[PDB]
């Protein structure tokens, strides 16, 4: 199974805008929510600082997504679904994907409770839910922070097993190659890269530079 080429995906994450939480009161649940929100904002900040040949393909795709208009088109694409095939302006057809949706949870659940009742939370399941949802973003941030924004092998925090197989079942390849790549997913994690690309227009996007074996 000789790796002869690359297939650059694009993995997005809908971020939120943390508007200043104007509520006074330091109950334990509110304090834990505040600590998690602070860790979230810190993750976004370190990622923005992380942004601001084996990865030549991912580098090129990152420079293309930095052009004005491209994120808009990807966002419109992955709008109602959680997977699309957007064709970038330079002719290449990239396979976007939306592996996490944190804007939804943060806004809809947290922001009302934080703003209306002056930060009075009732149950303790919401804080565990939020830290569970946020741990994946924090761990992507940690991996990028340590590896200088280019991570190999692609861990299970970047691209889980179900999502790696959903990516493999949509690549433009024969059925034999899909079968091979689905039977050796650990060797496909050990052979790719995860370039960190952009934070812009309220979204986090990184490029997963999967391999493709033309010789089998």
């Amino acid at each position, epitope marked *: 199974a000789l790796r002869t080429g690359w297939y650059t995906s694009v993995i997005t994450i809908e971020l939120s*805008n943390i508007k200043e939480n104007k509520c006074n009161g330091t109950d334990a649940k509110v304090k834990l929510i505040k600590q998690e929100l602070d860790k979230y904002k810190n993750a976004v900040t370190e990622l923005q600082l992380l942004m601001q040949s084996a990865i030549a393909s991912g580098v090129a795709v990152c420079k293309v997504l930095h052009l*004005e*208009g491209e994120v*808009n*088109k990807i*966002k*419109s*694409a992955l*709008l*109602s679904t959680n997977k699309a095939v957007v*064709s970038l*302006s330079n002719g290449v057809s990239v396979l976007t994907f939306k592996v996490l949706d944190l804007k939804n949870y943060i806004d809809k659940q947290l922001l009302p409770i934080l703003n209306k009742q002056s930060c009075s939370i009732s149950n303790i399941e919401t804080v565990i839910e939020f830290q569970q949802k946020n741990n994946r973003l924090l761990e992507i941030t940690r991996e990028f922070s340590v590896n200088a924004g280019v991570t190999t092998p692609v861990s299970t925090y970047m691209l889980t097993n179900s999502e790696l197989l959903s990516l493999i079942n949509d690549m433009p390849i024969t059925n034999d190659q899909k079968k091979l790549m689905s039977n050796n997913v650990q060797i496909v994690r050990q052979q790719s890269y995860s370039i960190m690309c952009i934070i*812009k*227009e*309220e979204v986090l996007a990184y490029v997963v530079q999967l391999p493709l074996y033309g010789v089998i």
Partner: antibody
Amino acid sequence: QIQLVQSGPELKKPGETVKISCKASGYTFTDYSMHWLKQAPGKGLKWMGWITTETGEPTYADDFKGRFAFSLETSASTAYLQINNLKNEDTGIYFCARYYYGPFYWGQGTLVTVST
Amino acid sequence: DIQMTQSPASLSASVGETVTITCRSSGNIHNFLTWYQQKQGKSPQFLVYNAKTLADGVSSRFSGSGSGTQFSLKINSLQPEDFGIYYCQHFWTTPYTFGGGTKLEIK
């Protein structure tokens, strides 16, 4: 809740200088670069350019090069345009917009008429 | 420099008919196109996020379709509200262009 309130109406004379401002509330101003859209009486809508809200670097459409100048104040969260050497043809409605999911978001216009 | 053209430069319909507007791109804008409607002296409010997936807040009678070089907005029923001027724009690559405009008036 994303708002882009714009300046008021104006009346100038050919050969003057004008500055139209666009205030942007409801989001982190530094996320989306702001785009400028010119309308015209009877003609169609015209997109003229944008200005990045991080570096301020502007870029212009080939019909709106030479005199139009975009600028912003990151702190105030507002961006403005400047149309040097007004002419009888620069009359119309000038729009400030940013990228929504697919389409734009238009703030109210500023009818800028140039008569003598 | 993809330039768009709308076929019904004028229009006239009843208060219960279904009317269909079309745009033809001068290039392959794969899927990216949108339809604004401008009321009597307002700012163009968009109706669809994309050629197909309409935008939240609007009524369900608007139904867009198309891909590549032939797109179609369909007002499945007219009311006093659905009257104005309808433009169409690509957002595939810069500079962005609009259709000539489709003026819709009562029959």
